[PDB]
Design an enzyme around this catalytic site. Structure first.
Site, PDB file in Angstrom:
ATOM      1  N   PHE A 136       0.825  -1.327  -0.098  1.00 13.50           N
ATOM      2  CA  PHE A 136       0.310   0.108   0.090  1.00 13.50           C
ATOM      3  C   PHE A 136       0.841   1.362   0.101  1.00 13.50           C
ATOM      4  N   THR A 154       4.896   3.359  -5.301  1.00 10.64           N
ATOM      5  CA  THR A 154       6.480   3.096  -5.370  1.00 10.64           C
ATOM      6  C   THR A 154       6.983   4.279  -4.531  1.00 10.64           C
ATOM      7  N   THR A 193      -5.422  -6.814 -10.304  1.00 11.28           N
ATOM      8  CA  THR A 193      -6.637  -6.875 -10.762  1.00 11.28           C
ATOM      9  C   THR A 193      -6.529  -6.480 -12.301  1.00 11.28           C
ATOM     10  N   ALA A 199      22.416   7.870 -11.027  1.00 10.61           N
ATOM     11  CA  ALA A 199      23.042   8.697 -10.502  1.00 10.61           C
ATOM     12  C   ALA A 199      22.624   8.854  -8.902  1.00 10.61           C
ATOM     13  N   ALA A 212      14.579  17.178 -10.270  1.00 13.85           N
ATOM     14  CA  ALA A 212      15.833  17.221  -9.712  1.00 13.85           C
ATOM     15  C   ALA A 212      16.583  15.912  -9.510  1.00 13.85           C
ATOM     16  N   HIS A 241      21.690  39.016   1.732  1.00 16.39           N
ATOM     17  CA  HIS A 241      23.137  38.830   1.776  1.00 16.39           C
ATOM     18  C   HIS A 241      23.554  38.393   2.946  1.00 16.39           C
TER      19      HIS A 241
HETATM   20  C1  LIG Z   1      14.136   4.884  -7.614  1.00 17.37           C
HETATM   21  C2  LIG Z   1      13.184   5.890  -7.702  1.00 17.37           C
HETATM   22  C3  LIG Z   1      13.207   7.312  -7.215  1.00 17.37           C
HETATM   23  C4  LIG Z   1      12.330   8.099  -7.370  1.00 17.37           C
HETATM   24  N1  LIG Z   1      12.290   9.324  -7.020  1.00 17.37           N
HETATM   25  C5  LIG Z   1      11.643  10.262  -7.334  1.00 17.37           C
HETATM   26  C6  LIG Z   1      11.863  11.754  -6.606  1.00 17.37           C
HETATM   27  O1  LIG Z   1      12.667  11.935  -6.030  1.00 17.37           O
HETATM   28  N2  LIG Z   1      10.824  12.682  -6.953  1.00 17.37           N
HETATM   29  C7  LIG Z   1       9.568  12.489  -7.869  1.00 17.37           C
HETATM   30  O2  LIG Z   1       9.133  13.469  -7.869  1.00 17.37           O
HETATM   31  N3  LIG Z   1       9.541  11.226  -8.419  1.00 17.37           N
HETATM   32  C8  LIG Z   1      10.394  10.243  -7.982  1.00 17.37           C
HETATM   33  N4  LIG Z   1      10.344   8.980  -8.543  1.00 17.37           N
HETATM   34  C9  LIG Z   1       9.142   8.787  -9.468  1.00 17.37           C
HETATM   35  C10 LIG Z   1       7.851   8.379  -8.783  1.00 17.37           C
HETATM   36  O3  LIG Z   1       8.147   7.489  -7.457  1.00 17.37           O
HETATM   37  C11 LIG Z   1       6.590   8.018  -9.649  1.00 17.37           C
HETATM   38  O4  LIG Z   1       6.421   9.130 -10.612  1.00 17.37           O
HETATM   39  C12 LIG Z   1       5.410   7.952  -8.941  1.00 17.37           C
HETATM   40  O5  LIG Z   1       5.459   6.527  -7.965  1.00 17.37           O
HETATM   41  C13 LIG Z   1       4.301   7.423  -9.633  1.00 17.37           C
HETATM   42  O6  LIG Z   1       3.171   7.494  -8.824  1.00 17.37           O
HETATM   43  P1  LIG Z   1       1.991   6.280  -9.516  1.00 17.37           P
HETATM   44  O7  LIG Z   1       0.748   6.212  -8.495  1.00 17.37           O
HETATM   45  O8  LIG Z   1       1.659   6.806 -10.750  1.00 17.37           O
HETATM   46  O9  LIG Z   1       2.711   4.810  -9.429  1.00 17.37           O
HETATM   47  P2  LIG Z   1       2.782   4.041  -8.163  1.00 17.37           P
HETATM   48  O10 LIG Z   1       2.985   4.694  -7.008  1.00 17.37           O
HETATM   49  O11 LIG Z   1       3.809   2.743  -8.804  1.00 17.37           O
HETATM   50  O12 LIG Z   1       1.320   3.227  -8.133  1.00 17.37           O
HETATM   51  C14 LIG Z   1       0.970   1.981  -8.571  1.00 17.37           C
HETATM   52  C15 LIG Z   1       0.618   1.034  -7.619  1.00 17.37           C
HETATM   53  O13 LIG Z   1      -0.430   0.031  -8.152  1.00 17.37           O
HETATM   54  C16 LIG Z   1       0.204  -1.168  -7.965  1.00 17.37           C
HETATM   55  N5  LIG Z   1      -0.635  -1.828  -9.508  1.00 17.37           N
HETATM   56  C17 LIG Z   1       0.161  -1.514 -10.540  1.00 17.37           C
HETATM   57  N6  LIG Z   1      -0.415  -2.483 -11.408  1.00 17.37           N
HETATM   58  C18 LIG Z   1      -1.485  -3.117 -10.895  1.00 17.37           C
HETATM   59  C19 LIG Z   1      -2.603  -3.900 -11.279  1.00 17.37           C
HETATM   60  N7  LIG Z   1      -2.571  -4.420 -12.545  1.00 17.37           N
HETATM   61  N8  LIG Z   1      -3.168  -4.612 -10.504  1.00 17.37           N
HETATM   62  C20 LIG Z   1      -3.195  -3.964  -8.922  1.00 17.37           C
HETATM   63  N9  LIG Z   1      -2.278  -3.226  -8.481  1.00 17.37           N
HETATM   64  C21 LIG Z   1      -1.399  -2.679  -9.489  1.00 17.37           C
HETATM   65  C22 LIG Z   1       1.503  -1.418  -7.753  1.00 17.37           C
HETATM   66  O14 LIG Z   1       1.983  -2.385  -7.067  1.00 17.37           O
HETATM   67  C23 LIG Z   1       1.547   0.140  -6.936  1.00 17.37           C
HETATM   68  O15 LIG Z   1       1.447  -0.079  -5.968  1.00 17.37           O
HETATM   69  C24 LIG Z   1      11.299   7.920  -8.389  1.00 17.37           C
HETATM   70  C25 LIG Z   1      10.968   6.793  -8.883  1.00 17.37           C
HETATM   71  C26 LIG Z   1      11.953   5.550  -8.605  1.00 17.37           C
HETATM   72  C27 LIG Z   1      11.757   4.199  -9.252  1.00 17.37           C
HETATM   73  C1  LIG Z   2      29.004  41.184  12.669  1.00 19.14           C
HETATM   74  C2  LIG Z   2      28.259  41.621  11.563  1.00 19.14           C
HETATM   75  C3  LIG Z   2      27.753  40.583  10.811  1.00 19.14           C
HETATM   76  C4  LIG Z   2      26.756  41.259   9.809  1.00 19.14           C
HETATM   77  N1  LIG Z   2      26.229  40.139   8.972  1.00 19.14           N
HETATM   78  C5  LIG Z   2      25.269  40.595   7.958  1.00 19.14           C
HETATM   79  C6  LIG Z   2      24.822  39.466   6.976  1.00 19.14           C
HETATM   80  O1  LIG Z   2      24.907  38.533   7.220  1.00 19.14           O
HETATM   81  N2  LIG Z   2      24.119  40.296   6.237  1.00 19.14           N
HETATM   82  C7  LIG Z   2      23.645  41.555   5.922  1.00 19.14           C
HETATM   83  O2  LIG Z   2      22.915  41.709   5.118  1.00 19.14           O
HETATM   84  N3  LIG Z   2      24.299  42.464   6.961  1.00 19.14           N
HETATM   85  C8  LIG Z   2      25.171  41.983   7.780  1.00 19.14           C
HETATM   86  N4  LIG Z   2      25.735  42.936   8.612  1.00 19.14           N
HETATM   87  C9  LIG Z   2      25.368  44.457   8.394  1.00 19.14           C
HETATM   88  C10 LIG Z   2      26.127  44.825   7.111  1.00 19.14           C
HETATM   89  O3  LIG Z   2      27.558  44.460   7.306  1.00 19.14           O
HETATM   90  C11 LIG Z   2      26.105  46.397   7.304  1.00 19.14           C
HETATM   91  O4  LIG Z   2      24.769  46.483   7.012  1.00 19.14           O
HETATM   92  C12 LIG Z   2      27.061  47.069   6.237  1.00 19.14           C
HETATM   93  O5  LIG Z   2      28.510  46.797   6.242  1.00 19.14           O
HETATM   94  C13 LIG Z   2      26.852  48.591   6.025  1.00 19.14           C
HETATM   95  O6  LIG Z   2      27.530  48.984   4.941  1.00 19.14           O
HETATM   96  P1  LIG Z   2      28.113  50.464   4.920  1.00 19.14           P
HETATM   97  O7  LIG Z   2      29.075  50.889   3.640  1.00 19.14           O
HETATM   98  O8  LIG Z   2      27.014  51.426   5.281  1.00 19.14           O
HETATM   99  O9  LIG Z   2      28.997  50.576   6.116  1.00 19.14           O
HETATM  100  P2  LIG Z   2      30.652  50.150   6.214  1.00 19.14           P
HETATM  101  O10 LIG Z   2      30.822  48.868   5.347  1.00 19.14           O
HETATM  102  O11 LIG Z   2      31.077  50.096   7.680  1.00 19.14           O
HETATM  103  O12 LIG Z   2      31.302  51.402   5.487  1.00 19.14           O
HETATM  104  C14 LIG Z   2      32.007  52.346   6.413  1.00 19.14           C
HETATM  105  C15 LIG Z   2      33.413  52.534   6.000  1.00 19.14           C
HETATM  106  O13 LIG Z   2      33.720  53.932   6.217  1.00 19.14           O
HETATM  107  C16 LIG Z   2      34.759  54.173   7.151  1.00 19.14           C
HETATM  108  N5  LIG Z   2      34.776  55.552   7.582  1.00 19.14           N
HETATM  109  C17 LIG Z   2      33.490  55.895   8.683  1.00 19.14           C
HETATM  110  N6  LIG Z   2      33.647  57.105   9.068  1.00 19.14           N
HETATM  111  C18 LIG Z   2      34.741  57.621   8.376  1.00 19.14           C
HETATM  112  C19 LIG Z   2      35.198  58.921   8.419  1.00 19.14           C
HETATM  113  N7  LIG Z   2      34.830  59.834   9.082  1.00 19.14           N
HETATM  114  N8  LIG Z   2      36.371  59.077   7.378  1.00 19.14           N
HETATM  115  C20 LIG Z   2      36.637  58.135   6.762  1.00 19.14           C
HETATM  116  N9  LIG Z   2      36.517  56.804   6.692  1.00 19.14           N
HETATM  117  C21 LIG Z   2      35.273  56.674   7.556  1.00 19.14           C
HETATM  118  C22 LIG Z   2      34.523  53.093   8.094  1.00 19.14           C
HETATM  119  O14 LIG Z   2      35.828  52.656   8.878  1.00 19.14           O
HETATM  120  C23 LIG Z   2      34.149  51.850   7.065  1.00 19.14           C
HETATM  121  O15 LIG Z   2      35.522  51.429   6.577  1.00 19.14           O
HETATM  122  C24 LIG Z   2      26.717  42.689   9.562  1.00 19.14           C
HETATM  123  C25 LIG Z   2      27.366  43.524  10.417  1.00 19.14           C
HETATM  124  C26 LIG Z   2      27.961  42.950  11.209  1.00 19.14           C
HETATM  125  C27 LIG Z   2      28.855  44.028  12.260  1.00 19.14           C
END
Ligand SMILES: Cc1cc2nc3c(=O)[nH]c(=O)nc-3n(C[C@H](O)[C@H](O)[C@H](O)COP(=O)(O)OP(=O)(O)OC[C@H]3O[C@@H](n4cnc5c(N)ncnc54)[C@H](O)[C@@H]3O)c2cc1C
Ligand SMILES: Cc1cc2nc3c(=O)[nH]c(=O)nc-3n(C[C@H](O)[C@H](O)[C@H](O)COP(=O)(O)OP(=O)(O)OC[C@H]3O[C@@H](n4cnc5c(N)ncnc54)[C@H](O)[C@@H]3O)c2cc1C
Ligand SMILES: NC(=O)c1ccc[n+]([C@@H]2O[C@H](COP(=O)([O-])OP(=O)(O)OC[C@H]3O[C@@H](n4cnc5c(N)ncnc54)[C@H](OP(=O)(O)O)[C@@H]3O)[C@@H](O)[C@H]2O)c1
Ligand SMILES: NC(=O)c1ccc[n+]([C@@H]2O[C@H](COP(=O)([O-])OP(=O)(O)OC[C@H]3O[C@@H](n4cnc5c(N)ncnc54)[C@H](OP(=O)(O)O)[C@@H]3O)[C@@H](O)[C@H]2O)c1
Lengths: 459, 459
Positions: free
Chosen positions: B35, B38, B112, B185, B348, B444
């Site tokens: 049930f 696949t 079936t 793959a 994918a 960022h």
């Molecule tokens: C290894 C593998 C990895 C996959 N990975 C992904 C993934 O990451 N992402 C993705 O989107 N898709 C993936 N797929 C595809 C996905 O599994 C299929 O597209 C999906 O199962 C389709 O569903 P279905 O109901 O059409 O088929 P099924 O799920 O196979 O349904 C059929 C069912 O009916 C039964 N049945 C069949 N014929 C009869 C019959 N005559 N009488 C009674 N019962 C019957 C079967 O036994 C089964 O239980 C993968 C497939 C495989 C093989």
């Molecule tokens: C630890 C930390 C982590 C962060 N992580 C993130 C993140 O993941 N994502 C994100 O989006 N933001 C993050 N931020 C915020 C981000 O870094 C700031 O918003 C950004 O640096 C601002 O850019 P700015 O050019 O306005 O300032 P700054 O990059 O600081 O530019 C100012 C520059 O001018 C110089 N200066 C200042 N006054 C004078 C002066 N009078 N004369 C000459 N030079 C001067 C300073 O020394 C400096 O070099 C983080 C900040 C910190 C502190």
């Protein structure tokens, strides 16, 4: 005295203004610290490189849950630091050499301040070495600097900030972090995954306070069981002991560890410029700008941490692009100028578990009078979550009941900053929750199914 | 004799047909094997659980590259199989009891086949046990089964397929896989990451034949340096050796290993039904259907592998949804019926490196007279790629030069099936490359930055 058409203070995002339309203009570039700004040298880029190495070691530690028996032999911290900054440090040097070797560009490696406005309307700028020059247009991209609570400064004790902690000599055994924001969560994840014991000292009760209610609560409860949380505590004293640090807390508690990291926010650098004398209005230390990145002084633009309500690199880069365009228009021709777009700003915290957000929280939507649909989707209810044996990952979506409009999304779990991008896209272009869920295919059994099922369970 | 309003052959996607609009109709459900079909028992769900555990061992194996020295002690294959199928087997059992415990549902656990058509237009169905019944409407969801080339069947040697290899007693040391498709793959990645040596026997020169030219080429050279590739070779003979297998090839070459896996495609199960006798036209073994999932026989629908041009679960589920609606209309009222949507179908391959794709390849777009923009973006040219030290990951995007319409996207790299979702969304909703690149924020420095920079580099 030297004459310039444009002057840019800061080589972070401020270095991204110059394009083909600026060749032929003599520009002055001012950098106090290292070229490239905060993000490249002491921020986003190096930190996330440290986060990746940490998560690799976390994988080895929990490998037995998946049937793979492994253990960590050694953490070559010196090699981790050298590998990361071994690629970063040449980029800052070469990037500085690119501007220096340009005939129309002059680099001033000093802290630059605003001088008095000249009669012809131009702006005078002088450095800490007493070198003065004038410029017709000026961009302020001075960024921000870490805020340190007064008691730690008063005690004169040695500490670390984001700007120093990534180059510590060797890995400590116990590390205190004061504060519980974005920097605290990330660096607590980095060092704890590498074996360091972690203590957090926060003046509040929760971590990542401004996140959505569901995320903040659940993240704090998970953090409490792997890091030591000293809730509702301020530091009122600190002193050294051999090579250790002692933290005296407001209730008489103590915290003893090898080093301390202060992650208590940052402060805009608009106060170190003599800005108000030249007509640049300041809000405390933040340069004030309008919807065009224009300050109150004529031909003076600002961008980035020095003025923006967001401390995010992708916002600072967009603001620099606005400035790049608006510098080539007449100062008063505002309708040929472009406006900044803050409509759907996202953010992520590269901690454990990762967190990502965009739009409104649940409370923000209710407080704005929205009739909301809401759903919380467990990673464990989706096939990719089974392969992870996931029990904590969640994605929360808030939508308006009427239209199906997307209002907010907040994810706590694996690949949060990745799988949130479709939700960013849908909001920025008005895609409804119904269309997004069933107007497109979702690959089975990939991770984005957790978002798909979250949209379908909006109730 | 027993009378039914509806009959469903297959409990894969066919088990997702029954919905609230069907309560009150006597339904007969027929399942030959386990049930759930696949995907649940021998396909997507169990296979990807193995891929995740394999990637954990990969993480440990290359951990020193990131500065963490670790190693694998032992691979508890018995514990892996038991953990995976320990959750799967109860789900197939519980799901079978849900239909059995319904008063209106009767489950027939036999193969079936179609009997002769009764006078009133009803359909006669008989099982392998000789129990007969009639039904007014029938859905064929029989899926597919693996095709095995003649020489392996003729040699009577023991072999494995996707249906058996995942429950093998112990891990072999060397494994041959015949074929180079999705199954080859993924299973090559699973076992090689868990320590098994891998040999691939393919009659062509490439490993991902139907993928984009760039993806197919680059993936093959990467595979050649970690798995042994036997290009342009068919298997013509095989025999035993102790507990080992020997494979004789068409050029007299030999391949010796512990076990063999045949990944040489699948075949729809429409030939095991006596379908043409009842007016169900077959294309070889595939049931033919129109745009409404209708077969050529009245009141007979088909879905899934038995009829679709796609062997994908997300396509099989949508087709079952189409059948779910169209079953409740008169057979001739096509204008109240919904059509199946096979536009922008994604897929994918959970290999190393992972692969994901949607839309047209580059060659397909030129052949359609498109003036194309194209870009290949390296992961290593983006900040998240630096944290990975990535040298092989790529994103390929093809767009129309005029409008910026997105035509195809193909990713080979980390989290491929994740970071492709925004490109699927954009194509399904007509977002251009310009809007997608700069009409929204990108976090960022998160991995989706590699997609953003790919759109900006369409040249
Ligand atoms: C290894 C593998 C990895 C996959 N990975 C992904 C993934 O990451 N992402 C993705 O989107 N898709 C993936 N797929 C595809 C996905 O599994 C299929 O597209 C999906 O199962 C389709 O569903 P279905 O109901 O059409 O088929 P099924 O799920 O196979 O349904 C059929 C069912 O009916 C039964 N049945 C069949 N014929 C009869 C019959 N005559 N009488 C009674 N019962 C019957 C079967 O036994 C089964 O239980 C993968 C497939 C495989 C093989
Ligand atoms: C630890 C930390 C982590 C962060 N992580 C993130 C993140 O993941 N994502 C994100 O989006 N933001 C993050 N931020 C915020 C981000 O870094 C700031 O918003 C950004 O640096 C601002 O850019 P700015 O050019 O306005 O300032 P700054 O990059 O600081 O530019 C100012 C520059 O001018 C110089 N200066 C200042 N006054 C004078 C002066 N009078 N004369 C000459 N030079 C001067 C300073 O020394 C400096 O070099 C983080 C900040 C910190 C502190
Ligand atoms: N990945 C990213 O996007 C990322 C990474 C790092 C940093 N950043 C950004 O960089 C900025 C700085 O980050 P941050 O974590 O340093 O700051 P933050 O995110 O604003 O959090 C600051 C923390 O410090 C505490 N704090 C502030 N002043 C204090 C004081 N005097 N005594 C004790 N505790 C105090 C705050 O407590 P209260 O909440 O009670 O005030 C809060 O817990 C933020 O804008 C953040 O968004 C972003
Ligand atoms: N994650 C997923 O989405 C996923 C995972 C697994 C499977 N699937 C689907 O399941 C189906 C079956 O997968 P599959 O890998 O078995 O088939 P497949 O992907 O169609 O590939 C079949 C392979 O078998 C080879 N082959 C065929 N006949 C052969 C013969 N006589 N001798 C030697 N080699 C032969 C083919 O070579 P030629 O190319 O030259 O014919 C090809 O390499 C496919 O539709 C696939 O898309 C999907």
């Amino acid at each position: 005295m030297e004459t310039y058409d444009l002057a840019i203070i800061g080589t972070g995002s401020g270095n991204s203004i110059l394009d083909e339309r600026y060749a032929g203009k003599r520009v002055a570039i001012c950098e106090q610290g290292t070229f490239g700004g905060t993000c490249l040298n002491v921020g986003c880029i190096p930190t996330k490189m440290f986060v990746y190495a940490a998560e690799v070691a976390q994988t080895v530690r929990g490998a037995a849950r998946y049937g793979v028996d492994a253990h960590i032999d050694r953490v070559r911290w010196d090699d981790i630091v050298s590998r990361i900054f071994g690629r970063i440090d040449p980029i800052a040097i070469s990037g500085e050499d690119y501007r220096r070797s340009s005939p129309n560009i002059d680099v001033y490696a000093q802290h630059t301040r605003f001088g008095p406005v000249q009669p012809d309307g131009r702006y005078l700028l002088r450095t800490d070495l007493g070198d003065e020059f004038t410029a017709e247009q000026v961009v302020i991209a001075a960024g921000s600097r870490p805020m340190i609570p007064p008691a730690i400064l008063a005690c004169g004790v040695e500490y670390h900030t984001s700007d120093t902690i990534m180059r510590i000599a060797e890995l400590p055994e116990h590390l205190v972090i004061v504060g519980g924001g974005f920097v605290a969560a990330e660096f607590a994840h980095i060092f704890s995954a590498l074996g360091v014991r972690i203590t957090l000292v926060i003046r509040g009760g929760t971590l990542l306070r401004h996140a959505d209610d569901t995320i903040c609560e659940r993240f704090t409860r998970l953090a409490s069981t792997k890091w030591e949380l000293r809730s509702h505590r301020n530091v009122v004293g600190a002193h050294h002991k051999g090579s250790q640090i002692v933290l005296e807390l407001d209730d008489g508690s103590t915290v003893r560890a090898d080093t301390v990291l202060v992650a208590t926010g940052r402060m805009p650098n608009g106060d170190l410029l003599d800005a108000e004398q030249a007509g640049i209005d300041l809000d405390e230390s933040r340069v004030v700008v309008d919807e065009y990145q224009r300050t109150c002084a004529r031909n003076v633009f600002a961008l980035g941490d020095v003025s923006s309500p967001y401390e995010l690199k992708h916002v600072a880069n967009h603001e620099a692009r606005v400035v790049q365009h608006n510098l080539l228009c007449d100062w008063d021709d505002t309708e040929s100028m472009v406006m900044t777009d803050h409509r759907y700003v996202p953010s992520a915290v590269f901690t454990d578990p990762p967190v990502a957000s965009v739009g409104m929280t649940e409370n923000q939507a209710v407080a704005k009078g929205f009739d909301i649909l809401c759903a919380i989707q467990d990673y464990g209810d989706v096939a990719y979550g089974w392969a992870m044996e996931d029990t904590t990952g969640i994605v929360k979506i808030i939508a308006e009941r009427g239209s199906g409009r997307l209002l907010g999304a907040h994810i706590m779990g694996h690949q949060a900053s990745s799988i949130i991008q479709p939700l960013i896209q849908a909001m920025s272009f008005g895609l409804t929750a119904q269309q997004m869920a069933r107007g497109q295919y979702w690959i089975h059994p990939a991770l984005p199914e957790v978002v798909e099922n979250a949209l379908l369970n909006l109730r």
